[PDB]
Amino acid sequence: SIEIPMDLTQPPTITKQSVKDHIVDPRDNILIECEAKGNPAPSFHWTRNSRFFNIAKDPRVSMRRRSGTLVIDFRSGGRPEEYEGEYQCFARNKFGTALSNRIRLQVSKSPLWPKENLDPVVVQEGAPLTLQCNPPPGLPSPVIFWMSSSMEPITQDKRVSQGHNGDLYFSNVMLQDMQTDYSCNARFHFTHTIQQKNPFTLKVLTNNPYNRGVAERTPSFMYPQGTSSSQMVLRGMDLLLECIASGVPTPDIAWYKKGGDLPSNKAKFENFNKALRITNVSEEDSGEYFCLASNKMGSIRHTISVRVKAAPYWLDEPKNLILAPGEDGRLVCRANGNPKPTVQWMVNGEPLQSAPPNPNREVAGDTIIFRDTQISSRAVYQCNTSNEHGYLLANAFVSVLDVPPRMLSARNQLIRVILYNRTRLDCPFFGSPIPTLRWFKNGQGSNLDGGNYHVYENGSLEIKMIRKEDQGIYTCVATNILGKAENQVRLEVKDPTRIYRMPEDQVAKRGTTVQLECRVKHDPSLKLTVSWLKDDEPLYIGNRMKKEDDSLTIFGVAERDQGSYTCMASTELDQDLAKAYLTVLAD
Ligand SMILES: *[C@@H]1O[C@H](CO)[C@@H](O[C@@H]2O[C@H](CO)[C@@H](O[C@@H]3O[C@H](CO[C@H]4O[C@H](CO[C@H]5O[C@H](CO)[C@@H](O)[C@H](O)[C@@H]5O)[C@@H](O)[C@H](O[C@H]5O[C@H](CO)[C@@H](O)[C@H](O)[C@@H]5O)[C@@H]4O)[C@@H](O)[C@H](O[C@H]4O[C@H](CO)[C@@H](O)[C@H](O)[C@@H]4O)[C@@H]3O)[C@H](O)[C@H]2NC(C)=O)[C@H](O)[C@H]1NC(C)=O
Ligand SMILES: *[C@@H]1O[C@H](CO)[C@@H](O[C@@H]2O[C@H](CO)[C@@H](O[C@@H]3O[C@H](CO[C@H]4O[C@H](CO)[C@@H](O)[C@H](O)[C@@H]4O)[C@@H](O)[C@H](O[C@H]4O[C@H](CO)[C@@H](O)[C@H](O)[C@@H]4O)[C@@H]3O)[C@H](O)[C@H]2NC(C)=O)[C@H](O)[C@H]1NC(C)=O
Ligand SMILES: *[C@@H]1O[C@H](CO)[C@@H](O[C@@H]2O[C@H](CO)[C@@H](O[C@@H]3O[C@H](CO[C@H]4O[C@H](CO)[C@@H](O)[C@H](O[C@H]5O[C@H](CO)[C@@H](O)[C@H](O)[C@@H]5O)[C@@H]4O)[C@@H](O)[C@H](O)[C@@H]3O)[C@H](O)[C@H]2NC(C)=O)[C@H](O)[C@H]1NC(C)=O
Ligand SMILES: *[C@@H]1O[C@H](CO)[C@@H](O[C@@H]2O[C@H](CO)[C@@H](O[C@@H]3O[C@H](CO[C@H]4O[C@H](CO)[C@@H](O)[C@H](O)[C@@H]4O)[C@@H](O)[C@H](O)[C@@H]3O)[C@H](O)[C@H]2NC(C)=O)[C@H](O)[C@H]1NC(C)=O
Numbered sequence: 001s002i003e004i005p006m007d008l009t010q011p012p013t014i015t016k017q018s019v020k021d022h023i024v025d026p027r028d029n030i031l032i033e034c035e036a037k038g039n040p041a042p043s044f045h046w047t048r049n050s051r052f053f054n055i056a057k058d059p060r061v062s063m064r065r066r067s068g069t070l071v072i073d074f075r076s077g078g079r080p081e082e083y084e085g086e087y088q089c090f091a092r093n094k095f096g097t098a099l100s101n102r103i104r105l106q107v108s109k110s111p112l113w114p115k116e117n118l119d120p121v122v123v124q125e126g127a128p129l130t131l132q133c134n135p136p137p138g139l140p141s142p143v144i145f146w147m148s149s150s151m152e153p154i155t156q157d158k159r160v161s162q163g164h165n166g167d168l169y170f171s172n173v174m175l176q177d178m179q180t181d182y183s184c185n186a187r188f189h190f191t192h193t194i195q196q197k198n199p200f201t202l203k204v205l206t207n208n209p210y211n212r213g214v215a216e217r218t219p220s221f222m223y224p225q226g227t228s229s230s231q232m233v234l235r236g237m238d239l240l241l242e243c244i245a246s247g248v249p250t251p252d253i254a255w256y257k258k259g260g261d262l263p264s265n266k267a268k269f270e271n272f273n274k275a276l277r278i279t280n281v282s283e284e285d286s287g288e289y290f291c292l293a294s295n296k297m298g299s300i301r302h303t304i305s306v307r308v309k310a311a312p313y314w315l316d317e318p319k320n321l322i323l324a325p326g327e328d329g330r331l332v333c334r335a336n337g338n339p340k341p342t343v344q345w346m347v348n349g350e351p352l353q354s355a356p357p358n359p360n361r362e363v364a365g366d367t368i369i370f371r372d373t374q375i376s377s378r379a380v381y382q383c384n385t386s387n388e389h390g391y392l393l394a395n396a397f398v399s400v401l402d403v404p405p406r407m408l409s410a411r412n413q414l415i416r417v418i419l420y421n422r423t424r425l426d427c428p429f430f431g432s433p434i435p436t437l438r439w440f441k442n443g444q445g446s447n448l449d450g451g452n453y454h455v456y457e458n459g460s461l462e463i464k465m466i467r468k469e470d471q472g473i474y475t476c477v478a479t480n481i482l483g484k485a486e487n488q489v490r491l492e493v494k495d496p497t498r499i500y501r502m503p504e505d506q507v508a509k510r511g512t513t514v515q516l517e518c519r520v521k522h523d524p525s526l527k528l529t530v531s532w533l534k535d536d537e538p539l540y541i542g543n544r545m546k547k548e549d550d551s552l553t554i555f556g557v558a559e560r561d562q563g564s565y566t567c568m569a570s571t572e573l574d575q576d577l578a579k580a581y582l583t584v585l586a587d
Contacts, residue, residue: 001319001320002320002430002458004039006037006039007039008039008403009039009040009095009401010037010038010039010095010399011038011093011095011096011098011380011397011399012036012037012038012042012091012092012093012095012096012097012098013036013037013038013098014034014035014036014089014091014098014100014395015035015036015037016033016034016035017033017034017035017089017100017101018032018033018034018103019103020101020102020103020104021104021106022103022104022105022106023106023107023108023139023140023190024080024105024106024107024108024190025107025108025190025191026079026080026081026107026108026191027074027191029071029072029073029074030071030072030074030080031069031070031071031072032069032070032087032103033069034067034068034069034070034089034091034100035067035068035069036067036068036091036098038091038093038095039093040093040094040095041066041093042068042091042092042093043091043092043093044063044067044068044089044090044091044092045068045089045090045092046068046070046087046088046089046090047087047088047090048085048086048087048088049085049086050086053087055070060072060073060074060076060078068089068091080107081107083105083107084105084106084107085104085105086102086103086104086105087102087103087105088100088101088102088103089103090349095378095399096348096378096379096380096397097348097349097379097380098380098395098397099349099380099382099395101393102393106139108139108140108188108189108190108191109137109138109139109188110188110191110193110195111136111137111138111195112136112195113135113136113195113196113197113198114136115198116198118198118200120200120201120202120203121200121201121202121203122202122203122204122205123173123202123203123204123205124204124205124206125173125174125175125204125205125206125207125208125214126172126173126174126214126215126217126248127172127173128170128171128172128173128220128222128246129169129170129173129202130167130168130169130170130222131167131168131169131170131182131200132167133165133166133167133168133184133186133197134166134167135166135184135186135195135197136195138186138188140188140189142186142187142188142195143186143187143189144162144165144166144184144185144186145162145185146162146168146182146183146184146185147183147185147196148180148181148182148183148199149181149183149199150180150181152180154180154182156272157272158250158252158272158273159171159172159174159250161271161272161274162271163223163242163244164240164242164275166184166186168182168184169222169223169244171222171244171245171246171247171250171251172217172246172247172248172250173202173204174204175204175206177202177204178201178202178203178204181199181200181201182199182200182201182202183196183197183198183199183200184196184197185197214248215248216248216249216297217247217248217297218247218295218297218298219245219246219247219251219293219295219297219298219299219300220245220246220247220300221244221245221246221293221300221302222244222245222246223242223243223244224242224243224244224302224304227301227302227303228302228303228304228305229302229303229304229305230304230305230307231304231305231306231307232307232309233281233306233308233309234281234308234309234310234311234389234390235281235282235283235308235309235310235311235313235338236280236281236310236313237280237281238277238278238279238281239277239278239281239285239306239308240275240276240277241255241275241276241289241291241304241306242271242274242275243255243274243291243293243302244274245293245295245300247293247295247297247298248297249295249296249297250295251293251294251295252273252293252294252295253273253274253291253292253293253294254273254291254292254294255269255273255276255289255290255291255292256289256290256291256292257287257288257289257290258287258288258289258290260287263278263284263285265279266278266279266280276289281308282308283308285306285308286306286307286308287306288303288304288305288306289303289304289306290302290303290304291304307338308338309337309338309339309389310336310337310338310389311337311387311389311390311391311392312335312336312337312341312385312386312387312390312391312392313335313336313337313392314334314335314392314394315334315335315336316332316333316334317333317394318331318332318333318381318383318394318396319396320396320397320398320399321370321396321398322398322399322434323370323373323398323400324400324432324433325373325374325375325400326372326373326374327372327373328369328370328371328372328373329369329370329373329398330367330368330369330370331367331368331381331396332366332367333345333366333367333383333385333394334366335385335392337385337387337389339387339388340387341385341386341387341391341392342385342386342387343366343383343384343385344383344384344385344386345363345368345381345382345383346381346382346384347379347381347382348379348380349382358376358377360372360373360374360376360377361377368381373398375400378397378398378399378400379397379398380395380396380397381395381396381397382394382395383395383396401432402432402482403431403432403482404431404432404480404482404483404484404485405429405430405431405435405478405479405480405482405483405484405485406429406430406431406478406485407428407429407478407485407486407487408428408429408430409426409427409428409487411487411488412488412489412490413425413426413487413488413489413490414489414490414492415489415490415491415492416492416494416572416573417466417491417492417493417494417573418493418494418495418496418497418573418574419466419468419493419494419495419496420465420466420496421465421466421496421573422462422463422464422465422466423462423463423466423491424460424461424462424463425460425461425462425463425474425476425489425491426458426459426460427459427460427461427476427487427489428458428459428460429458429459429476429478429485430478431478431480431482432480432482433480433481433482434480435478435479435480435484436478436479436480437455437459437476437477437478437479438476438477438479439453439455439461439474439475439476440474440475440477441472441473441474441475442472442473443473448461448474452464452465452467452470459476459478461474461476466493468493470491470493471491471492471493472490472491473488473489473490473491474488474489474490474491475487475488475489476488476489494523494525494526494573495521495522495523496573496574497520497521497522497523497526497528497569497570497571497573497574497575497576498520498521498576499518499519499520499521499567499569499576499578500519500520500521501517501518501519502517502518502567502578502579502580503516503517503518503565503567503578503579503580504516504517504580505580505581505582506580506582506583507582507583507584507585508557508582508583508584508585509557509584509585509586509587510557510558510559510584510585510586510587511556511557511558512557513553513554513555513556513557514553514554514557514582515551515552515553515554516551516552516553516565516567516580517550517551518530518550518551518552518567518569518578519550520550520569520576522569522571522574523571526571526572526573527571527572528569528570528571529568529569529570529571530567530568530569531568532552532565532566532567532568533565533566533568534563534564534565535563535564536564536566539565544556552565552567557582557584558584559584559586561582561584562582562583562584563581563582564579564580564581564582565579565580565581565582566578566579567579567580
């Protein structure tokens, strides 16, 4: 899209808005950002659960100047809990009306643990255990972890560990486990609060007599019951898998995939090889993953169907259509999702069914067509692509104006660059009908287009690799049926800064004055900076250290001076580094 300054007539456009699922803190004076841009003063208003919400009536709520950002003050009192639900921001002006996402405003809850009577659980030496947390309802899912009442972080290793769900898992209980209590703890991000479940205790029943006394045993599956399970993760998300075993000799978990090698760049082991995590996920990663609980006595596999589904994501987001009277335009709302996301069309937040009828407007599948567009039907169109999992919302408006091409950058720019480096000329422009911009060099009639000259949407001209021929005066002209505008830029190819004589690596004894030569070629008409780095951090010039134009001298070396010195020669357009190692002997 293209931006418009304030002075020029402009429909509304939302700069910044809060999250769809906006979660908040009960303490703070609560603030909701809704900011819009519009040459004619936009007016802002709000709606909760599909019913208007009156700001003036509520004394606590007040509005920022020249924006729709709302602030609520709790000094008097009151409670955020009563404000939960779906809210919507509306920014209106003469030209049109712009909407925002439906904000599922909820306040983070940090409920205390229900005081429950806990009998300590018992077990014979070396049987498996599943220690259950089951927190009270938590939005968001709290940070779960296990602590002693003595406040010490609790023994976690290959043998025994915690799940993502929050329960603790013992492949095999040992004698030592009785030493301490185990208490579940949950953090809530927003309030910075931790909840502690009543601590557990265990009892062990070794009967072994004096006379590896305890019996050995097969592995078994504990968390993923049965052979098979299904998990769904959305595209682009972090994928996480877990496998829990139970064998007297501590089982070892290995992870693999159906007829294919694991992408090592993205996958990694967490939680002592009992968790596997991947980075951004694609349909590549979709398929069948399984896990082995290898053990000396037996070994077993669990399979998981990893169907990579997706909340809708934009393939082609509809961008603003600028048309001259009688030009043809189409709006494309294409979101990819698994299952396929359902497309929903509204006109200024009104159902298309009952919208004012228009002959130019034709709707088909997911696309809207205006043939021979006129002043009529100038409004903001909305697309809600939604599925079981999630939804995406997109706005697009059409503005009709009649103005000649305008120049948006400084006149007579001066641009500098070295020989074989990529460069860019920024000549931004704009016009009511799409004006053709053309480049001219050294007063040549022929417009510059083709090899080694490329033009983008905004008008910046890129030189992929520069020759000495390219240097000179460039004129960019934006023109259309209505009128024209012109602008000048001078392009200068200068000489790169390269270090032809590097400092010499050397071995010196204590109390000798040493010199390092760093000769660099730079263009005479350029700002050169030459500094040094000791080891791997910047060096400070001082007493006993003399800096010559092309060399550096140190008096009175010792063992501390030993190391790597780095000559840095930089100009506005270029940078080069040279390194030398100095070693020191003893007396
Ligand atoms: C873009 O479109 C998408 C959808 O395509 C839309 O997302 C929907 O958003 C609304 C509003 O937030 C969600 O509706 C909520 O529904 C709550 C009850 O959940 C049940 O009903 C859901 C559908 O709501 C309709 O039916 C209910 C009665 O069922 C009715 O109250 C509503 O008014 C509405 O007519 C349904 O999706 C949901 O299904 C989930 O859970 C079931 C198990 O229960 C499970 O089987 C499903 O697989 C799924 O997981 C469930 O059946 C409702 O409580 C809530 O508010 C209502 O109650 C309050 C309090 O009484 C009232 O004040 C209020 O008026 C409502 O009556 C709300 O209505 C809906 O669930 C979303 N749909 C999907 C698919 O996610 C986006 O918002 C759209 N985007 C934009 C920008 O508009
Ligand atoms: C103007 O634009 C040009 C072109 O874009 C820039 O040239 C780049 O300069 C950097 C150095 O800043 C080059 O990085 C070089 O990497 C070499 C190894 O390259 C291979 O392997 C890398 C991955 O490691 C691949 O990406 C690449 O394709 C190659 O296959 C090193 O050997 C280089 O170091 C040595 O030579 C340089 C020469 O300048 C010396 O100064 C060093 O001291 C050292 O002796 C170097 O690190 C990069 O490859 C260049 N090309 C590109 C496309 O980036 C200019 O930096 C830029 N500015 C100017 C010219 O002033
Ligand atoms: C997960 O996120 C990443 C990061 O956003 C996504 O990576 C983008 O992938 C697309 C599609 O391939 C890329 O478009 C390509 O760009 C290539 C240029 O890449 C060079 O420069 C990169 C830095 O800009 C550099 O990282 C890369 O080196 C790495 O990959 C090389 C691939 O050959 C490999 O040889 C190297 O060893 C190193 O691992 C290259 O030097 C270009 O060559 C292609 O033709 C194509 O245009 C984007 O550039 C990637 N993003 C970025 C920031 O570079 C990835 O797709 C995401 N995956 C999923 C599943 O969502
Ligand atoms: C008109 O549209 C043109 C579309 O191509 C614009 O040309 C592009 O201009 C940009 C901005 O100067 C150039 O971006 C370059 O990016 C490199 C690398 O980025 C560095 O910084 C990022 C920060 O995230 C970092 O991730 C990278 O690793 C790099 O460290 C910079 O080194 C360059 O200086 C420059 O910023 C593009 O190169 C250029 N297009 C192409 C294809 O090269 C043009 O700017 C637009 N005109 C206007 C007025 O907006």
